[PDB]
PDB file of C-alpha atoms and ligand atoms in Angstrom:
ATOM      1  CA  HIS A   9       0.987 -21.741  31.493  1.00  0.00           C
ATOM      2  CA  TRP A  10      -1.266 -22.317  27.773  1.00  0.00           C
ATOM      3  CA  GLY A  11      -0.082 -20.310  25.029  1.00  0.00           C
ATOM      4  CA  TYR A  12       1.621 -21.373  21.705  1.00  0.00           C
ATOM      5  CA  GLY A  13       5.512 -22.621  22.240  1.00  0.00           C
ATOM      6  CA  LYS A  14       6.538 -26.203  21.724  1.00  0.00           C
ATOM      7  CA  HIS A  15       5.963 -26.712  25.209  1.00  0.00           C
ATOM      8  CA  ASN A  16       3.000 -24.947  26.036  1.00  0.00           C
ATOM      9  CA  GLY A  17       0.920 -24.966  22.708  1.00  0.00           C
ATOM     10  CA  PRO A  18      -2.061 -25.879  21.244  1.00  0.00           C
ATOM     11  CA  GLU A  19      -1.145 -29.671  20.932  1.00  0.00           C
ATOM     12  CA  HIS A  20      -0.828 -29.258  25.257  1.00  0.00           C
ATOM     13  CA  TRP A  21      -3.686 -27.565  25.823  1.00  0.00           C
ATOM     14  CA  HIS A  22      -6.374 -30.545  26.000  1.00  0.00           C
ATOM     15  CA  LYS A  23      -4.422 -32.212  29.166  1.00  0.00           C
ATOM     16  CA  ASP A  24      -5.329 -28.862  31.393  1.00  0.00           C
ATOM     17  CA  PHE A  25      -8.796 -28.334  29.094  1.00  0.00           C
ATOM     18  CA  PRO A  26      -9.793 -31.472  27.955  1.00  0.00           C
ATOM     19  CA  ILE A  27     -12.831 -30.051  25.843  1.00  0.00           C
ATOM     20  CA  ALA A  28      -9.837 -29.345  23.292  1.00  0.00           C
ATOM     21  CA  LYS A  29     -11.073 -32.746  21.638  1.00  0.00           C
ATOM     22  CA  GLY A  30     -14.422 -32.071  21.660  1.00  0.00           C
ATOM     23  CA  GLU A  31     -16.963 -32.420  19.186  1.00  0.00           C
ATOM     24  CA  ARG A  32     -17.549 -28.508  18.382  1.00  0.00           C
ATOM     25  CA  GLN A  33     -14.461 -27.300  18.284  1.00  0.00           C
ATOM     26  CA  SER A  34     -13.030 -24.035  16.348  1.00  0.00           C
ATOM     27  CA  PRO A  35     -11.241 -23.162  14.092  1.00  0.00           C
ATOM     28  CA  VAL A  36     -12.102 -25.019  11.598  1.00  0.00           C
ATOM     29  CA  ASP A  37     -11.339 -25.907   8.006  1.00  0.00           C
ATOM     30  CA  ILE A  38     -14.183 -24.023   5.497  1.00  0.00           C
ATOM     31  CA  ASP A  39     -14.271 -26.407   2.652  1.00  0.00           C
ATOM     32  CA  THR A  40     -16.191 -23.613   0.362  1.00  0.00           C
ATOM     33  CA  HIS A  41     -17.635 -26.532  -2.309  1.00  0.00           C
ATOM     34  CA  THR A  42     -19.108 -28.623   0.324  1.00  0.00           C
ATOM     35  CA  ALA A  43     -20.415 -25.294   2.406  1.00  0.00           C
ATOM     36  CA  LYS A  44     -24.105 -25.184   1.265  1.00  0.00           C
ATOM     37  CA  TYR A  45     -26.013 -21.746   0.717  1.00  0.00           C
ATOM     38  CA  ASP A  46     -29.130 -21.504   3.850  1.00  0.00           C
ATOM     39  CA  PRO A  47     -32.490 -19.429   2.738  1.00  0.00           C
ATOM     40  CA  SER A  48     -33.618 -20.271   5.910  1.00  0.00           C
ATOM     41  CA  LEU A  49     -30.673 -17.504   7.397  1.00  0.00           C
ATOM     42  CA  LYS A  50     -31.974 -14.099   8.015  1.00  0.00           C
ATOM     43  CA  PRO A  51     -30.419 -11.194   6.918  1.00  0.00           C
ATOM     44  CA  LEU A  52     -27.278  -9.929   8.910  1.00  0.00           C
ATOM     45  CA  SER A  53     -27.303  -6.765  11.059  1.00  0.00           C
ATOM     46  CA  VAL A  54     -23.883  -5.453  12.003  1.00  0.00           C
ATOM     47  CA  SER A  55     -24.840  -2.417  14.344  1.00  0.00           C
ATOM     48  CA  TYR A  56     -21.949  -0.703  15.810  1.00  0.00           C
ATOM     49  CA  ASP A  57     -22.725   2.986  15.179  1.00  0.00           C
ATOM     50  CA  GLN A  58     -22.761   3.628  18.895  1.00  0.00           C
ATOM     51  CA  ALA A  59     -20.106   1.674  20.063  1.00  0.00           C
ATOM     52  CA  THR A  60     -18.086   2.919  22.817  1.00  0.00           C
ATOM     53  CA  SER A  61     -14.438   1.343  22.999  1.00  0.00           C
ATOM     54  CA  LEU A  62     -12.799   1.716  26.330  1.00  0.00           C
ATOM     55  CA  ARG A  63      -8.944   0.069  26.439  1.00  0.00           C
ATOM     56  CA  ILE A  64      -6.948  -1.571  24.816  1.00  0.00           C
ATOM     57  CA  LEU A  65      -4.742  -4.526  26.402  1.00  0.00           C
ATOM     58  CA  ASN A  66      -2.071  -6.837  26.061  1.00  0.00           C
ATOM     59  CA  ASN A  67      -3.039  -9.869  27.967  1.00  0.00           C
ATOM     60  CA  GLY A  68       0.134 -11.783  26.680  1.00  0.00           C
ATOM     61  CA  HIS A  69      -1.683 -14.072  24.318  1.00  0.00           C
ATOM     62  CA  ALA A  70      -3.279 -11.074  21.768  1.00  0.00           C
ATOM     63  CA  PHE A  71      -4.112  -7.638  22.261  1.00  0.00           C
ATOM     64  CA  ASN A  72      -8.281  -6.757  23.291  1.00  0.00           C
ATOM     65  CA  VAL A  73      -9.532  -3.878  22.036  1.00  0.00           C
ATOM     66  CA  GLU A  74     -12.338  -3.351  24.761  1.00  0.00           C
ATOM     67  CA  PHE A  75     -16.123  -2.430  24.669  1.00  0.00           C
ATOM     68  CA  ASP A  76     -18.478  -0.960  27.324  1.00  0.00           C
ATOM     69  CA  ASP A  77     -21.416  -3.731  27.266  1.00  0.00           C
ATOM     70  CA  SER A  78     -23.361  -2.475  29.975  1.00  0.00           C
ATOM     71  CA  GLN A  79     -26.515  -1.361  27.519  1.00  0.00           C
ATOM     72  CA  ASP A  80     -27.248  -2.014  24.394  1.00  0.00           C
ATOM     73  CA  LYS A  81     -24.851  -0.117  21.488  1.00  0.00           C
ATOM     74  CA  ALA A  82     -22.549  -2.150  19.235  1.00  0.00           C
ATOM     75  CA  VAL A  83     -24.538  -5.367  18.404  1.00  0.00           C
ATOM     76  CA  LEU A  84     -25.339  -7.934  16.127  1.00  0.00           C
ATOM     77  CA  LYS A  85     -28.289  -9.269  15.250  1.00  0.00           C
ATOM     78  CA  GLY A  86     -29.765 -11.701  12.702  1.00  0.00           C
ATOM     79  CA  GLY A  87     -28.099 -14.280  10.252  1.00  0.00           C
ATOM     80  CA  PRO A  88     -28.149 -17.506  12.595  1.00  0.00           C
ATOM     81  CA  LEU A  89     -28.825 -15.927  15.465  1.00  0.00           C
ATOM     82  CA  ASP A  90     -31.862 -15.798  17.682  1.00  0.00           C
ATOM     83  CA  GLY A  91     -31.858 -12.561  19.536  1.00  0.00           C
ATOM     84  CA  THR A  92     -29.297  -9.709  20.491  1.00  0.00           C
ATOM     85  CA  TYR A  93     -25.530 -10.098  20.902  1.00  0.00           C
ATOM     86  CA  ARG A  94     -23.933  -7.498  22.107  1.00  0.00           C
ATOM     87  CA  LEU A  95     -19.596  -6.280  21.016  1.00  0.00           C
ATOM     88  CA  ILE A  96     -17.561  -6.904  24.534  1.00  0.00           C
ATOM     89  CA  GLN A  97     -13.696  -6.963  22.840  1.00  0.00           C
ATOM     90  CA  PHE A  98     -12.279  -7.414  19.688  1.00  0.00           C
ATOM     91  CA  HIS A  99      -8.829  -8.712  18.935  1.00  0.00           C
ATOM     92  CA  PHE A 100      -6.558 -10.457  16.393  1.00  0.00           C
ATOM     93  CA  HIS A 101      -4.535 -13.694  15.779  1.00  0.00           C
ATOM     94  CA  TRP A 102      -1.146 -13.384  13.209  1.00  0.00           C
ATOM     95  CA  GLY A 103       1.402 -15.615  12.120  1.00  0.00           C
ATOM     96  CA  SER A 104       5.204 -14.650  12.107  1.00  0.00           C
ATOM     97  CA  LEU A 105       5.013 -14.118   8.353  1.00  0.00           C
ATOM     98  CA  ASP A 106       2.404 -13.232   5.513  1.00  0.00           C
ATOM     99  CA  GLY A 107       1.884 -16.787   4.964  1.00  0.00           C
ATOM    100  CA  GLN A 108       0.131 -17.904   7.835  1.00  0.00           C
ATOM    101  CA  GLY A 109      -1.604 -16.712  10.730  1.00  0.00           C
ATOM    102  CA  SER A 110      -5.582 -17.208  10.411  1.00  0.00           C
ATOM    103  CA  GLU A 111      -7.250 -19.421  12.804  1.00  0.00           C
ATOM    104  CA  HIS A 112     -10.363 -20.324   9.960  1.00  0.00           C
ATOM    105  CA  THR A 113      -8.737 -21.689   6.966  1.00  0.00           C
ATOM    106  CA  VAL A 114     -10.762 -21.317   3.352  1.00  0.00           C
ATOM    107  CA  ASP A 115      -9.862 -24.838   1.539  1.00  0.00           C
ATOM    108  CA  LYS A 116      -6.829 -24.978   3.276  1.00  0.00           C
ATOM    109  CA  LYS A 117      -5.811 -21.591   2.790  1.00  0.00           C
ATOM    110  CA  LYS A 118      -4.090 -19.925   5.699  1.00  0.00           C
ATOM    111  CA  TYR A 119      -4.579 -15.916   5.355  1.00  0.00           C
ATOM    112  CA  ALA A 120      -2.056 -13.691   7.419  1.00  0.00           C
ATOM    113  CA  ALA A 121      -4.494 -12.403   9.972  1.00  0.00           C
ATOM    114  CA  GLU A 122      -7.754 -13.219  11.622  1.00  0.00           C
ATOM    115  CA  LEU A 123     -10.313 -10.346  13.441  1.00  0.00           C
ATOM    116  CA  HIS A 124     -12.353 -11.516  15.894  1.00  0.00           C
ATOM    117  CA  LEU A 125     -14.997  -9.339  17.395  1.00  0.00           C
ATOM    118  CA  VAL A 126     -16.785 -11.195  20.267  1.00  0.00           C
ATOM    119  CA  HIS A 127     -20.681 -10.412  20.969  1.00  0.00           C
ATOM    120  CA  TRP A 128     -22.549 -12.316  24.078  1.00  0.00           C
ATOM    121  CA  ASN A 129     -26.340 -13.248  24.065  1.00  0.00           C
ATOM    122  CA  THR A 130     -28.203 -10.539  25.989  1.00  0.00           C
ATOM    123  CA  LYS A 131     -30.478 -12.865  26.983  1.00  0.00           C
ATOM    124  CA  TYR A 132     -28.205 -14.475  29.478  1.00  0.00           C
ATOM    125  CA  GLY A 133     -27.666 -11.208  31.154  1.00  0.00           C
ATOM    126  CA  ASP A 134     -23.415 -11.296  31.303  1.00  0.00           C
ATOM    127  CA  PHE A 135     -20.998 -12.547  29.622  1.00  0.00           C
ATOM    128  CA  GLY A 136     -19.780 -15.349  32.169  1.00  0.00           C
ATOM    129  CA  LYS A 137     -23.460 -16.647  32.244  1.00  0.00           C
ATOM    130  CA  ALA A 138     -23.321 -16.844  28.273  1.00  0.00           C
ATOM    131  CA  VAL A 139     -19.893 -19.291  28.341  1.00  0.00           C
ATOM    132  CA  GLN A 140     -22.266 -21.348  29.983  1.00  0.00           C
ATOM    133  CA  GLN A 141     -24.800 -21.881  27.075  1.00  0.00           C
ATOM    134  CA  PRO A 142     -24.408 -23.562  23.483  1.00  0.00           C
ATOM    135  CA  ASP A 143     -25.463 -20.367  22.558  1.00  0.00           C
ATOM    136  CA  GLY A 144     -23.979 -17.875  24.612  1.00  0.00           C
ATOM    137  CA  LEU A 145     -21.571 -16.267  21.990  1.00  0.00           C
ATOM    138  CA  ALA A 146     -21.373 -15.177  18.551  1.00  0.00           C
ATOM    139  CA  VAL A 147     -18.166 -14.227  17.105  1.00  0.00           C
ATOM    140  CA  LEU A 148     -17.588 -12.140  13.542  1.00  0.00           C
ATOM    141  CA  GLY A 149     -14.130 -13.429  12.232  1.00  0.00           C
ATOM    142  CA  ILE A 150     -12.823 -11.464   9.327  1.00  0.00           C
ATOM    143  CA  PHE A 151      -9.725 -12.469   7.546  1.00  0.00           C
ATOM    144  CA  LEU A 152      -6.579  -9.961   6.499  1.00  0.00           C
ATOM    145  CA  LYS A 153      -4.564 -10.571   3.869  1.00  0.00           C
ATOM    146  CA  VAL A 154      -1.665  -8.326   2.648  1.00  0.00           C
ATOM    147  CA  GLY A 155      -1.565  -5.357   0.846  1.00  0.00           C
ATOM    148  CA  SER A 156      -3.268  -1.790   0.329  1.00  0.00           C
ATOM    149  CA  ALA A 157      -3.344   0.120   3.977  1.00  0.00           C
ATOM    150  CA  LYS A 158      -6.508  -0.532   5.951  1.00  0.00           C
ATOM    151  CA  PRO A 159      -6.951   3.403   7.049  1.00  0.00           C
ATOM    152  CA  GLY A 160      -9.576   1.987  10.098  1.00  0.00           C
ATOM    153  CA  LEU A 161      -6.760   0.215  11.711  1.00  0.00           C
ATOM    154  CA  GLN A 162      -3.747   2.846  11.805  1.00  0.00           C
ATOM    155  CA  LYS A 163      -5.390   3.808  15.179  1.00  0.00           C
ATOM    156  CA  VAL A 164      -4.932   0.417  16.346  1.00  0.00           C
ATOM    157  CA  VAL A 165      -1.550   0.133  15.123  1.00  0.00           C
ATOM    158  CA  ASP A 166      -0.298   3.353  16.446  1.00  0.00           C
ATOM    159  CA  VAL A 167      -0.995   2.237  19.612  1.00  0.00           C
ATOM    160  CA  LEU A 168       0.866  -0.833  19.777  1.00  0.00           C
ATOM    161  CA  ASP A 169       4.413   0.461  21.246  1.00  0.00           C
ATOM    162  CA  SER A 170       2.268   1.983  24.033  1.00  0.00           C
ATOM    163  CA  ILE A 171       1.186  -1.890  25.459  1.00  0.00           C
ATOM    164  CA  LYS A 172       4.288  -3.996  24.298  1.00  0.00           C
ATOM    165  CA  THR A 173       4.465  -6.316  26.834  1.00  0.00           C
ATOM    166  CA  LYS A 174       1.967  -8.896  28.890  1.00  0.00           C
ATOM    167  CA  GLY A 175      -0.403  -6.512  31.437  1.00  0.00           C
ATOM    168  CA  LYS A 176       0.394  -3.499  30.065  1.00  0.00           C
ATOM    169  CA  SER A 177      -3.112  -1.280  29.037  1.00  0.00           C
ATOM    170  CA  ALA A 178      -4.037   2.187  27.409  1.00  0.00           C
ATOM    171  CA  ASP A 179      -7.175   4.326  26.959  1.00  0.00           C
ATOM    172  CA  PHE A 180      -8.769   3.512  23.771  1.00  0.00           C
ATOM    173  CA  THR A 181     -11.712   5.792  23.516  1.00  0.00           C
ATOM    174  CA  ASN A 182     -13.491   6.955  20.559  1.00  0.00           C
ATOM    175  CA  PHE A 183     -12.183   3.879  17.843  1.00  0.00           C
ATOM    176  CA  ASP A 184     -14.924   2.573  15.351  1.00  0.00           C
ATOM    177  CA  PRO A 185     -14.880  -0.810  14.924  1.00  0.00           C
ATOM    178  CA  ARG A 186     -16.613  -0.217  11.558  1.00  0.00           C
ATOM    179  CA  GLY A 187     -13.585   0.989   9.865  1.00  0.00           C
ATOM    180  CA  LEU A 188     -12.223  -2.900  10.143  1.00  0.00           C
ATOM    181  CA  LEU A 189     -15.360  -4.255   8.133  1.00  0.00           C
ATOM    182  CA  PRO A 190     -14.885  -5.186   4.480  1.00  0.00           C
ATOM    183  CA  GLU A 191     -17.811  -4.286   1.837  1.00  0.00           C
ATOM    184  CA  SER A 192     -19.836  -7.405   1.409  1.00  0.00           C
ATOM    185  CA  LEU A 193     -21.277  -9.372   4.646  1.00  0.00           C
ATOM    186  CA  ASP A 194     -21.326 -12.701   2.738  1.00  0.00           C
ATOM    187  CA  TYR A 195     -20.484 -15.041   5.351  1.00  0.00           C
ATOM    188  CA  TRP A 196     -20.224 -18.874   6.673  1.00  0.00           C
ATOM    189  CA  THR A 197     -21.424 -19.957   9.511  1.00  0.00           C
ATOM    190  CA  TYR A 198     -21.464 -23.227  12.115  1.00  0.00           C
ATOM    191  CA  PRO A 199     -21.543 -23.846  15.690  1.00  0.00           C
ATOM    192  CA  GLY A 200     -17.817 -23.819  17.755  1.00  0.00           C
ATOM    193  CA  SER A 201     -16.238 -23.183  20.398  1.00  0.00           C
ATOM    194  CA  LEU A 202     -13.512 -20.573  21.915  1.00  0.00           C
ATOM    195  CA  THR A 203     -10.108 -20.799  20.104  1.00  0.00           C
ATOM    196  CA  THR A 204      -8.375 -20.328  23.062  1.00  0.00           C
ATOM    197  CA  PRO A 205      -8.479 -21.840  26.475  1.00  0.00           C
ATOM    198  CA  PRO A 206     -10.773 -22.177  27.852  1.00  0.00           C
ATOM    199  CA  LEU A 207     -12.372 -23.612  24.596  1.00  0.00           C
ATOM    200  CA  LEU A 208     -15.583 -23.447  25.660  1.00  0.00           C
ATOM    201  CA  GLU A 209     -17.943 -24.588  22.758  1.00  0.00           C
ATOM    202  CA  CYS A 210     -20.652 -21.455  23.217  1.00  0.00           C
ATOM    203  CA  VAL A 211     -19.882 -19.907  19.809  1.00  0.00           C
ATOM    204  CA  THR A 212     -22.139 -19.297  16.567  1.00  0.00           C
ATOM    205  CA  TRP A 213     -19.145 -18.615  14.100  1.00  0.00           C
ATOM    206  CA  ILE A 214     -20.062 -16.259  11.328  1.00  0.00           C
ATOM    207  CA  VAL A 215     -16.699 -15.865   8.770  1.00  0.00           C
ATOM    208  CA  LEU A 216     -16.949 -13.419   6.251  1.00  0.00           C
ATOM    209  CA  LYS A 217     -15.966 -14.494   2.816  1.00  0.00           C
ATOM    210  CA  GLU A 218     -14.481 -11.368   1.927  1.00  0.00           C
ATOM    211  CA  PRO A 219     -11.108 -10.904   3.595  1.00  0.00           C
ATOM    212  CA  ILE A 220      -9.744  -7.238   4.319  1.00  0.00           C
ATOM    213  CA  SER A 221      -6.504  -5.592   3.240  1.00  0.00           C
ATOM    214  CA  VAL A 222      -4.228  -4.757   5.477  1.00  0.00           C
ATOM    215  CA  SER A 223      -0.806  -3.198   4.804  1.00  0.00           C
ATOM    216  CA  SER A 224       2.888  -5.385   5.552  1.00  0.00           C
ATOM    217  CA  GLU A 225       3.626  -1.769   7.728  1.00  0.00           C
ATOM    218  CA  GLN A 226       0.616  -2.645   9.628  1.00  0.00           C
ATOM    219  CA  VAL A 227       0.979  -6.627   9.924  1.00  0.00           C
ATOM    220  CA  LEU A 228       4.610  -6.109  10.607  1.00  0.00           C
ATOM    221  CA  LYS A 229       3.694  -3.417  13.972  1.00  0.00           C
ATOM    222  CA  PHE A 230       1.419  -6.345  15.107  1.00  0.00           C
ATOM    223  CA  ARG A 231       4.942  -8.906  15.246  1.00  0.00           C
ATOM    224  CA  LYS A 232       6.360  -6.161  17.624  1.00  0.00           C
ATOM    225  CA  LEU A 233       4.430  -6.939  20.416  1.00  0.00           C
ATOM    226  CA  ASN A 234       5.638  -9.146  23.221  1.00  0.00           C
ATOM    227  CA  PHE A 235       3.994 -12.427  24.720  1.00  0.00           C
ATOM    228  CA  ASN A 236       6.052 -11.319  27.853  1.00  0.00           C
ATOM    229  CA  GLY A 237       5.919  -8.921  30.539  1.00  0.00           C
ATOM    230  CA  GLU A 238       8.134  -5.943  31.052  1.00  0.00           C
ATOM    231  CA  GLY A 239      11.963  -7.059  32.258  1.00  0.00           C
ATOM    232  CA  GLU A 240      11.476 -10.488  31.039  1.00  0.00           C
ATOM    233  CA  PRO A 241      13.084 -12.357  27.937  1.00  0.00           C
ATOM    234  CA  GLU A 242      11.695 -10.778  24.758  1.00  0.00           C
ATOM    235  CA  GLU A 243       9.098 -13.112  22.609  1.00  0.00           C
ATOM    236  CA  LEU A 244       7.658 -11.814  20.095  1.00  0.00           C
ATOM    237  CA  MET A 245       3.825 -12.133  19.900  1.00  0.00           C
ATOM    238  CA  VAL A 246       3.407 -14.022  16.381  1.00  0.00           C
ATOM    239  CA  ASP A 247       2.072 -17.051  15.280  1.00  0.00           C
ATOM    240  CA  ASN A 248      -0.979 -16.931  17.937  1.00  0.00           C
ATOM    241  CA  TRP A 249      -3.478 -18.947  15.912  1.00  0.00           C
ATOM    242  CA  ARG A 250      -4.855 -22.427  16.758  1.00  0.00           C
ATOM    243  CA  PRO A 251      -4.862 -24.551  13.662  1.00  0.00           C
ATOM    244  CA  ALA A 252      -8.212 -26.236  12.488  1.00  0.00           C
ATOM    245  CA  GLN A 253      -9.724 -28.370  14.432  1.00  0.00           C
ATOM    246  CA  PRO A 254     -12.040 -31.845  13.164  1.00  0.00           C
ATOM    247  CA  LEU A 255     -14.887 -30.598  11.786  1.00  0.00           C
ATOM    248  CA  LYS A 256     -16.805 -33.903  13.525  1.00  0.00           C
ATOM    249  CA  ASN A 257     -20.995 -33.586  13.145  1.00  0.00           C
ATOM    250  CA  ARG A 258     -21.144 -29.952  11.535  1.00  0.00           C
ATOM    251  CA  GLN A 259     -22.059 -28.400   8.442  1.00  0.00           C
ATOM    252  CA  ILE A 260     -21.096 -25.201   7.092  1.00  0.00           C
ATOM    253  CA  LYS A 261     -23.779 -23.144   5.955  1.00  0.00           C
ATOM    254  CA  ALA A 262     -23.010 -20.294   3.579  1.00  0.00           C
ATOM    255  CA  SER A 263     -25.433 -17.095   3.217  1.00  0.00           C
ATOM    256  CA  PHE A 264     -24.741 -16.669  -0.417  1.00  0.00           C
ATOM    257  CA  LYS A 265     -26.249 -18.757  -3.501  1.00  0.00           C
TER     258      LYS A 265
HETATM  259  N1  4SO B 301      -2.459 -27.543  29.127  1.00  0.00           N
HETATM  260  S1  4SO B 301      -1.557 -26.184  28.693  1.00  0.00           S
HETATM  261  O1  4SO B 301      -2.467 -25.356  29.587  1.00  0.00           O
HETATM  262  O2  4SO B 301      -0.859 -26.087  27.465  1.00  0.00           O
HETATM  263  C1  4SO B 301       0.034 -26.189  29.599  1.00  0.00           C
HETATM  264  C2  4SO B 301       1.365 -26.854  28.875  1.00  0.00           C
HETATM  265  C3  4SO B 301       2.209 -26.748  29.358  1.00  0.00           C
HETATM  266  C4  4SO B 301       2.458 -26.378  31.035  1.00  0.00           C
HETATM  267  C5  4SO B 301       4.154 -25.811  31.774  1.00  0.00           C
HETATM  268  O3  4SO B 301       4.858 -26.674  30.779  1.00  0.00           O
HETATM  269  O4  4SO B 301       4.044 -25.633  32.710  1.00  0.00           O
HETATM  270  C6  4SO B 301       1.048 -25.600  31.836  1.00  0.00           C
HETATM  271  C7  4SO B 301       0.288 -25.666  31.170  1.00  0.00           C
HETATM  272  N1  4SO B 302     -17.398  -4.097  29.233  1.00  0.00           N
HETATM  273  S1  4SO B 302     -16.206  -3.658  30.291  1.00  0.00           S
HETATM  274  O1  4SO B 302     -15.851  -4.230  31.191  1.00  0.00           O
HETATM  275  O2  4SO B 302     -15.033  -2.866  29.798  1.00  0.00           O
HETATM  276  C1  4SO B 302     -15.133  -5.170  29.796  1.00  0.00           C
HETATM  277  C2  4SO B 302     -14.702  -5.486  28.440  1.00  0.00           C
HETATM  278  C3  4SO B 302     -14.137  -6.592  28.095  1.00  0.00           C
HETATM  279  C4  4SO B 302     -13.178  -7.581  28.797  1.00  0.00           C
HETATM  280  C5  4SO B 302     -14.504  -7.212  30.279  1.00  0.00           C
HETATM  281  C6  4SO B 302     -14.845  -6.534  30.162  1.00  0.00           C
HETATM  282  N1  4SO B 303     -10.579 -16.277  19.908  1.00  0.00           N
HETATM  283  S1  4SO B 303     -12.067 -16.566  20.645  1.00  0.00           S
HETATM  284  O1  4SO B 303     -12.671 -17.960  20.298  1.00  0.00           O
HETATM  285  O2  4SO B 303     -12.689 -15.542  19.811  1.00  0.00           O
HETATM  286  C1  4SO B 303     -11.813 -16.086  22.266  1.00  0.00           C
HETATM  287  C2  4SO B 303     -12.845 -15.358  22.510  1.00  0.00           C
HETATM  288  C3  4SO B 303     -12.977 -15.212  24.120  1.00  0.00           C
HETATM  289  C4  4SO B 303     -12.259 -15.642  24.887  1.00  0.00           C
HETATM  290  C5  4SO B 303     -12.228 -15.653  26.076  1.00  0.00           C
HETATM  291  O3  4SO B 303     -13.363 -15.086  26.611  1.00  0.00           O
HETATM  292  O4  4SO B 303     -11.839 -16.361  26.740  1.00  0.00           O
HETATM  293  C6  4SO B 303     -11.231 -16.944  24.247  1.00  0.00           C
HETATM  294  C7  4SO B 303     -11.572 -16.787  22.485  1.00  0.00           C
HETATM  295  O1  BGC B 304     -32.145 -34.138   4.719  1.00  0.00           O
HETATM  296  C1  BGC B 304     -32.118 -33.342   4.166  1.00  0.00           C
HETATM  297  C2  BGC B 304     -31.445 -32.202   4.656  1.00  0.00           C
HETATM  298  O2  BGC B 304     -30.132 -32.749   5.099  1.00  0.00           O
HETATM  299  C3  BGC B 304     -29.159 -31.649   5.890  1.00  0.00           C
HETATM  300  O3  BGC B 304     -27.674 -32.536   6.546  1.00  0.00           O
HETATM  301  C4  BGC B 304     -29.279 -30.761   5.193  1.00  0.00           C
HETATM  302  O4  BGC B 304     -28.477 -29.456   6.688  1.00  0.00           O
HETATM  303  C5  BGC B 304     -30.126 -29.700   4.454  1.00  0.00           C
HETATM  304  O5  BGC B 304     -29.801 -28.686   4.389  1.00  0.00           O
HETATM  305  C6  BGC B 304     -30.899 -30.915   4.196  1.00  0.00           C
HETATM  306  O6  BGC B 304     -32.143 -30.492   3.873  1.00  0.00           O
HETATM  307 ZN1   ZN B 305      -9.781 -15.026  18.654  1.00  0.00          ZN
END
């Protein structure tokens, strides 16, 4: 099965998912000097006040915090987006050490981790239909660097001991994702893909320029999770990131002058 190891990692995914070599794959390196300010971008609206988190799941590749997306509650609008995109889940990608872990890079810089807030375009009715559309998804990506602790992350950190292995889940109600944002909403945007199989080319990426700081202790707890299921040999869940892919016929636009 696909994963991140030597025998099943990103360099193998194309055999079973040939779109891995496609024309709008993610992540990419963000060359900050070539990215151009785009005055046509409308103000970005991250509206998470009525979010309803439900559950946290170790799916064997990351952990997902899942949300009720049966009505417009936590939504993302504006910026490059046409219409309303509902939050369905967030997850992270992270490294074995602080010097790697992000999927996107900034002038080739790798951050310690990267948060993905995943949203689907309500015009398509359900997530499954949305991933049949070029504009079906919007992922808000936020870099993590190691420094001071992120208080709004601690509830996530503290539940991880209860979902150590693949297939375990736990209640995760009343979690407010606004506590994971940075101060500034300055961003870069480009058209891309899911960064894990099935690698579908459905995503408008919105990558915030300002990282959040998390403490070493917080990210160290991410790295105690397991890729494996209960009773199987322990394989620490680390380095669950795809490297940057070819930019091909794309431009990265900036929201800021
Ligand atoms: N293309 S892939 O889904 O990454 C993949 C890689 C390896 C194996 C395997 O060793 O069994 C199966 C699938
Ligand atoms: N809205 S939900 O049924 O809780 C859900 C959340 C994440 C992935 C699949 C379903
Ligand atoms: N890492 S990511 O590009 O945000 C992502 C989000 C969702 C899915 C999925 O539902 O399969 C895959 C990848
Ligand atoms: O033809 C000029 C145009 O080229 C495009 O590649 C750029 O995205 C635009 O910002 C520019 O105005
Ligand atoms: Zn992701």
